[PDB]
């Protein structure tokens, strides 16, 4: 999950 809204932004 945290990956993830780094990586969306």
Not at 1 to 9: E, G, K, N, P, Q
Request: hydrophobic share 80%; aromatic share 0%; net charge neutral.
């Amino acid at each position: 999950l945290a990956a993830s809204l780094a990586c969306a932004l």
